[PDB]
Amino acid sequence: SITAANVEELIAKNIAERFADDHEVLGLSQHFRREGYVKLPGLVSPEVFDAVAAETHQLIDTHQKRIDIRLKETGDSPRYMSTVGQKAIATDGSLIPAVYESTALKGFLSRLAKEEVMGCPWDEEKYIITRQHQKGDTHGWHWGDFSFTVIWLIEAPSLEYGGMLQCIPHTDWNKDDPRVEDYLQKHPIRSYGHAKGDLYLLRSDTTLHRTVPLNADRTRIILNTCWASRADQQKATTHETMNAMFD
Numbered sequence: 001s002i003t004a005a006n007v008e009e010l011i012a013k014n015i016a017e018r019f020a021d022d023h024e025v026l027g028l029s030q031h032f033r034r035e036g037y038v039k040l041p042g043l044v045s046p047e048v049f050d051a052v053a054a055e056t057h058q059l060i061d062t063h064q065k066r067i068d069i070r071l072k073e074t075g076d077s078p079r080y081m082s083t084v085g086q087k088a089i090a091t092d093g094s095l096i097p098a099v100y101e102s103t104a105l106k107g108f109l110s111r112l113a114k115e116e117v118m119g120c121p122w123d124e125e126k127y128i129i130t131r132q133h134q135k136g137d138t139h140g141w142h143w144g145d146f147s148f149t150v151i152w153l154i155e156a157p158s159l160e161y162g163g164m165l166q167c168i169p170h171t172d173w174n175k176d177d178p179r180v181e182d183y184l185q186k187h188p189i190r191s192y193g194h195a196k197g198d199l200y201l202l203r204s205d206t207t208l209h210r211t212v213p214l215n216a217d218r219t220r221i222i223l224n225t226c227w228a229s230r231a232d233q234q235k236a237t238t239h240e241t242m243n244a245m246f247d
Protein backbone atom coordinates (compact mmCIF):
# COMPACT_ATOMS: atom_id res chain seq x y z
CA SER A 1 0.00 0.00 0.00
CA ILE A 2 2.80 2.41 0.95
CA THR A 3 5.42 2.40 -1.81
CA ALA A 4 8.41 4.37 -3.03
CA ALA A 5 6.01 6.16 -5.39
CA ASN A 6 3.55 7.47 -2.78
CA VAL A 7 5.60 7.70 0.43
CA GLU A 8 6.92 11.22 -0.20
CA GLU A 9 3.44 12.77 -0.21
CA LEU A 10 2.56 10.91 3.00
CA ILE A 11 5.75 12.13 4.69
CA ALA A 12 5.03 15.74 3.69
CA LYS A 13 1.38 15.60 4.82
CA ASN A 14 2.36 14.18 8.22
CA ILE A 15 5.06 16.80 8.78
CA ALA A 16 2.63 19.62 7.86
CA GLU A 17 0.17 18.37 10.51
CA ARG A 18 2.45 17.01 13.23
CA PHE A 19 4.80 20.01 13.39
CA ALA A 20 2.33 22.86 12.77
CA ASP A 21 3.18 24.64 16.05
CA ASP A 22 6.21 26.87 15.35
CA HIS A 23 6.94 27.27 19.07
CA GLU A 24 7.09 23.50 19.56
CA VAL A 25 9.47 23.20 16.60
CA LEU A 26 11.67 25.94 18.08
CA GLY A 27 11.83 23.99 21.35
CA LEU A 28 12.73 20.78 19.52
CA SER A 29 15.55 22.62 17.72
CA GLN A 30 16.88 24.05 20.97
CA HIS A 31 16.76 20.65 22.66
CA PHE A 32 18.60 19.10 19.70
CA ARG A 33 21.32 21.75 19.85
CA ARG A 34 21.72 21.79 23.65
CA GLU A 35 21.64 18.04 24.22
CA GLY A 36 22.78 16.68 20.83
CA TYR A 37 19.54 14.70 20.85
CA VAL A 38 15.83 15.25 20.47
CA LYS A 39 12.98 12.75 20.56
CA LEU A 40 10.67 13.06 17.53
CA PRO A 41 7.57 10.92 18.11
CA GLY A 42 5.39 11.00 15.03
CA LEU A 43 8.21 12.19 12.75
CA VAL A 44 6.60 9.86 10.22
CA SER A 45 3.05 8.58 10.50
CA PRO A 46 2.34 5.16 12.08
CA GLU A 47 1.49 3.79 8.62
CA VAL A 48 4.80 4.89 7.11
CA PHE A 49 6.67 3.56 10.15
CA ASP A 50 5.00 0.14 9.89
CA ALA A 51 5.81 -0.07 6.19
CA VAL A 52 9.44 0.78 6.94
CA ALA A 53 9.52 -1.78 9.77
CA ALA A 54 8.16 -4.53 7.51
CA GLU A 55 10.95 -3.85 4.99
CA THR A 56 13.51 -3.82 7.83
CA HIS A 57 12.45 -7.27 9.08
CA GLN A 58 12.68 -8.64 5.53
CA LEU A 59 16.21 -7.26 5.09
CA ILE A 60 17.34 -8.71 8.42
CA ASP A 61 16.11 -12.19 7.54
CA THR A 62 17.89 -12.18 4.18
CA HIS A 63 21.13 -10.40 5.06
CA GLN A 64 21.93 -10.08 8.78
CA LYS A 65 25.51 -10.79 9.87
CA ARG A 66 26.55 -11.51 13.45
CA ILE A 67 29.39 -9.37 14.80
CA ASP A 68 31.23 -9.59 18.13
CA ILE A 69 34.02 -7.02 17.83
CA ARG A 70 35.70 -4.16 19.71
CA LEU A 71 36.98 -1.04 17.92
CA LYS A 72 40.21 0.67 18.92
CA GLU A 73 39.05 3.94 17.32
CA THR A 74 36.38 4.23 20.05
CA GLY A 75 38.52 3.03 22.94
CA ASP A 76 37.95 -0.70 22.27
CA SER A 77 34.23 -0.36 23.00
CA PRO A 78 32.14 -3.36 21.88
CA ARG A 79 29.80 -3.90 18.97
CA TYR A 80 27.89 -7.09 19.87
CA MET A 81 24.88 -7.35 17.56
CA SER A 82 23.77 -8.49 14.13
CA THR A 83 23.84 -5.96 11.27
CA VAL A 84 22.60 -5.31 7.75
CA GLY A 85 24.80 -3.06 5.62
CA GLN A 86 23.84 -0.20 3.33
CA LYS A 87 24.66 -2.09 0.14
CA ALA A 88 22.09 -4.80 0.89
CA ILE A 89 19.39 -2.26 1.79
CA ALA A 90 20.04 -0.34 -1.43
CA THR A 91 19.98 -3.57 -3.46
CA ASP A 92 16.88 -5.19 -1.89
CA GLY A 93 14.85 -2.34 -0.41
CA SER A 94 12.70 0.34 -1.97
CA LEU A 95 10.93 2.19 0.81
CA ILE A 96 14.09 2.86 2.82
CA PRO A 97 16.04 4.43 -0.09
CA ALA A 98 12.96 6.51 -0.95
CA VAL A 99 12.57 7.79 2.63
CA TYR A 100 16.28 8.62 2.71
CA GLU A 101 15.81 10.85 -0.36
CA SER A 102 12.76 12.60 1.14
CA THR A 103 12.80 16.33 0.42
CA ALA A 104 10.15 16.93 3.11
CA LEU A 105 11.94 14.89 5.79
CA LYS A 106 15.30 16.51 5.08
CA GLY A 107 13.64 19.93 5.02
CA PHE A 108 12.11 19.45 8.45
CA LEU A 109 15.40 18.18 9.87
CA SER A 110 17.02 21.28 8.35
CA ARG A 111 14.62 23.42 10.43
CA LEU A 112 15.79 21.68 13.61
CA ALA A 113 19.49 21.80 12.68
CA LYS A 114 19.25 25.39 11.36
CA GLU A 115 21.37 24.32 8.37
CA GLU A 116 21.04 22.15 5.28
CA VAL A 117 20.57 18.47 6.07
CA MET A 118 21.71 16.59 2.99
CA GLY A 119 22.72 13.22 1.64
CA CYS A 120 25.76 11.57 3.12
CA PRO A 121 28.80 11.80 0.78
CA TRP A 122 29.80 8.20 1.53
CA ASP A 123 27.00 5.98 0.21
CA GLU A 124 27.71 3.09 2.57
CA GLU A 125 26.68 5.12 5.64
CA LYS A 126 23.34 6.43 4.33
CA TYR A 127 21.33 3.74 6.13
CA ILE A 128 22.08 0.60 8.14
CA ILE A 129 20.19 -1.80 10.41
CA THR A 130 21.27 -3.27 13.73
CA ARG A 131 19.60 -6.12 15.61
CA GLN A 132 20.50 -6.74 19.25
CA HIS A 133 19.15 -10.10 20.36
CA GLN A 134 21.47 -11.80 22.87
CA LYS A 135 22.18 -11.00 26.51
CA GLY A 136 25.14 -8.60 26.52
CA ASP A 137 24.42 -7.14 23.06
CA THR A 138 25.21 -3.42 22.83
CA HIS A 139 26.22 -0.59 20.55
CA GLY A 140 29.16 0.54 22.67
CA TRP A 141 30.45 4.08 23.18
CA HIS A 142 31.13 5.78 19.87
CA TRP A 143 30.67 8.77 17.61
CA GLY A 144 29.44 8.87 14.04
CA ASP A 145 31.44 10.13 11.09
CA PHE A 146 28.53 12.38 10.00
CA SER A 147 26.29 14.92 11.62
CA PHE A 148 22.58 14.02 11.46
CA THR A 149 21.37 10.56 12.52
CA VAL A 150 17.70 9.56 12.84
CA ILE A 151 17.11 6.29 14.69
CA TRP A 152 13.94 4.27 14.07
CA LEU A 153 12.90 1.97 16.93
CA ILE A 154 11.73 -1.02 14.90
CA GLU A 155 11.59 -3.34 17.94
CA ALA A 156 12.50 -2.79 21.56
CA PRO A 157 12.14 -4.60 24.90
CA SER A 158 11.02 -3.04 28.15
CA LEU A 159 13.77 -0.71 29.36
CA GLU A 160 14.66 -2.79 32.41
CA TYR A 161 16.10 -5.26 29.89
CA GLY A 162 18.59 -2.72 28.50
CA GLY A 163 18.71 -0.67 25.31
CA MET A 164 18.55 2.80 26.88
CA LEU A 165 20.45 5.45 24.89
CA GLN A 166 23.15 7.49 26.65
CA CYS A 167 24.68 10.73 25.36
CA ILE A 168 27.35 13.35 26.02
CA PRO A 169 27.02 16.30 23.60
CA HIS A 170 29.60 18.88 22.49
CA THR A 171 32.47 16.37 22.27
CA ASP A 172 34.58 15.25 19.31
CA TRP A 173 35.90 12.02 17.80
CA ASN A 174 39.70 11.71 17.74
CA LYS A 175 40.24 8.27 16.21
CA ASP A 176 43.92 8.14 17.23
CA ASP A 177 43.21 9.02 20.89
CA PRO A 178 39.46 8.95 21.55
CA ARG A 179 39.71 9.41 25.36
CA VAL A 180 36.23 8.04 26.03
CA GLU A 181 36.64 7.73 29.82
CA ASP A 182 38.03 11.26 30.04
CA TYR A 183 34.84 12.57 28.41
CA LEU A 184 32.64 10.58 30.81
CA GLN A 185 34.48 12.19 33.73
CA LYS A 186 34.29 15.72 32.35
CA HIS A 187 30.58 15.91 31.54
CA PRO A 188 27.27 14.42 32.70
CA ILE A 189 25.62 11.59 30.80
CA ARG A 190 21.99 11.98 29.75
CA SER A 191 20.01 8.74 29.36
CA TYR A 192 16.97 8.40 27.09
CA GLY A 193 14.47 5.54 26.83
CA HIS A 194 12.61 4.58 23.66
CA ALA A 195 9.78 2.23 22.79
CA LYS A 196 8.81 0.51 19.54
CA GLY A 197 7.56 3.05 17.03
CA ASP A 198 9.71 5.91 18.38
CA LEU A 199 12.09 8.03 16.30
CA TYR A 200 14.84 10.31 17.49
CA LEU A 201 17.44 12.64 16.01
CA LEU A 202 21.05 12.64 17.14
CA ARG A 203 23.98 14.93 16.38
CA SER A 204 26.19 11.89 15.90
CA ASP A 205 29.53 13.58 15.15
CA THR A 206 29.69 15.62 18.38
CA THR A 207 27.55 13.46 20.71
CA LEU A 208 29.36 10.56 22.34
CA HIS A 209 26.72 7.86 22.62
CA ARG A 210 25.91 4.19 23.22
CA THR A 211 23.10 1.79 24.05
CA VAL A 212 22.98 0.14 27.49
CA PRO A 213 23.68 -3.60 27.05
CA LEU A 214 20.84 -6.08 27.06
CA ASN A 215 20.68 -7.98 30.34
CA ALA A 216 18.44 -10.74 28.91
CA ASP A 217 17.73 -12.47 25.60
CA ARG A 218 15.46 -9.80 24.05
CA THR A 219 15.20 -8.17 20.63
CA ARG A 220 16.03 -4.51 19.88
CA ILE A 221 16.11 -3.48 16.21
CA ILE A 222 16.86 -0.03 14.83
CA LEU A 223 17.12 1.50 11.40
CA ASN A 224 19.77 4.24 11.22
CA THR A 225 19.21 6.80 8.46
CA CYS A 226 22.24 9.10 8.53
CA TRP A 227 22.36 12.50 6.81
CA ALA A 228 25.16 15.01 6.63
CA SER A 229 26.04 18.70 6.70
CA ARG A 230 27.71 20.92 4.13
CA ALA A 231 31.03 20.67 6.00
CA ASP A 232 30.67 16.87 6.10
CA GLN A 233 30.76 16.84 2.29
CA GLN A 234 34.36 18.02 2.05
CA LYS A 235 36.04 16.74 5.21
CA ALA A 236 38.42 13.80 4.89
CA THR A 237 36.74 10.76 6.46
CA THR A 238 38.06 7.27 7.19
CA HIS A 239 35.50 4.46 7.39
CA GLU A 240 37.18 1.75 9.49
CA THR A 241 34.39 1.34 12.06
CA MET A 242 31.83 1.17 9.24
CA ASN A 243 33.89 -1.40 7.31
CA ALA A 244 34.30 -3.48 10.48
CA MET A 245 30.60 -3.69 11.34
CA PHE A 246 28.78 -4.06 7.99
CA ASP A 247 29.08 -6.08 4.80
Ligand SMILES: N[C@@H](CCCC[NH3+])C(=O)O
Residues within 6 Å of the ligand: 071, 074, 079, 125, 128, 142, 143, 144, 145, 149, 224, 226, 241, 242, 245
Ligand atom coordinates in the same frame (compact mmCIF):
# COMPACT_ATOMS: atom_id res chain seq x y z
N1 LIG B 1 30.96 4.92 13.76
C1 LIG B 1 29.92 4.01 14.23
C2 LIG B 1 29.44 3.11 13.09
C3 LIG B 1 27.94 3.12 12.89
C4 LIG B 1 27.45 4.50 12.44
C5 LIG B 1 26.13 4.42 11.70
N2 LIG B 1 25.88 5.62 10.85
C6 LIG B 1 30.46 3.16 15.37
O1 LIG B 1 31.63 3.30 15.74
O2 LIG B 1 29.75 2.29 15.91
